[PDB]
Amino acid sequence: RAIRPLKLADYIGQPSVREQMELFIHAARGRQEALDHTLIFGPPGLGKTTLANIIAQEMGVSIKSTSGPVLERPGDLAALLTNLEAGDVLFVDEIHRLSPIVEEVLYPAMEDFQLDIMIAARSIKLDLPPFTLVGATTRAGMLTNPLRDRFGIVQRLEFYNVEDLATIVSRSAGILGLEIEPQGAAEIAKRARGTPRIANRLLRRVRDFAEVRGQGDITRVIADKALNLLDVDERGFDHLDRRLLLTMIDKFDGGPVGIDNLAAALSEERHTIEDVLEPYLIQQGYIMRTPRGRVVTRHAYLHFGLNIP
């Protein structure tokens, strides 16, 4: 029972990007040709395979959702391409982790749909039917320059707009059956943390709060009562984050810090911090990073009235 819009117009969250890719879909449909290669990158976990399946039903063809471990050997991908047909498409994931032998096999596969292979050297030339190679990675920066320059469509995925996050909150609460408020929708959009999954988790938890504290009612006051104590903040801070900030600023006064020293002093190993708490705050930019220590920026000083050295 996962959250999934049925259609591309039904897909809501990136309206300009949705219109762009709808234009690409109608370009594939009208031209009666396989759609160009689409590069996809952005958030790591977003259910991209399901969206590729939706694109498959929009094309009406089959897309083999494949990844790096699936296509780590060139033989497996060659076999899948041989079972691929005209007008079909192949979802590819973890292209960055894939071996360069895969890259050289996929050079002629998209280069006008051919295949060249060596056998005292003898050359064997093979052909491939036209198709839509789909390349989606968590990060596209590791893609090699000739390969990415030879591609066609490049599409970016990102967390939704705050008003559009609020609309997604409203739709998911209607799916979940929660009697949510537009003020509460904007509240959870401010709490969306850039992640739809943790957003839906917050909808579930405020639904539980409205069930056990209110009379099944989600309002702005109910949402504030649910999300203004413990690891919460209107911007996205936690009391873990506030503790980290306070412990950095009382010790080193916004100066260079030792990461092992921080892990020892906080009674909290630095690994989880740099895995969840630090990357979000640096995603907001609020911590500036040095090779001699992580320091918060002027935003955190303005949060607590602190000076600037």
Add this chain to the structure above:
DNA sequence: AAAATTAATATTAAATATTTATTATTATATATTATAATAT
């Protein structure tokens, strides 16, 4: 003297197919080495 020939004549005995320590050689994090700026 000095090497080649041959008839007795005592002598010797037939074990393969498998198997496990005993050597090769192939990754994989992880406690090392390292640099850069930085106060004092």
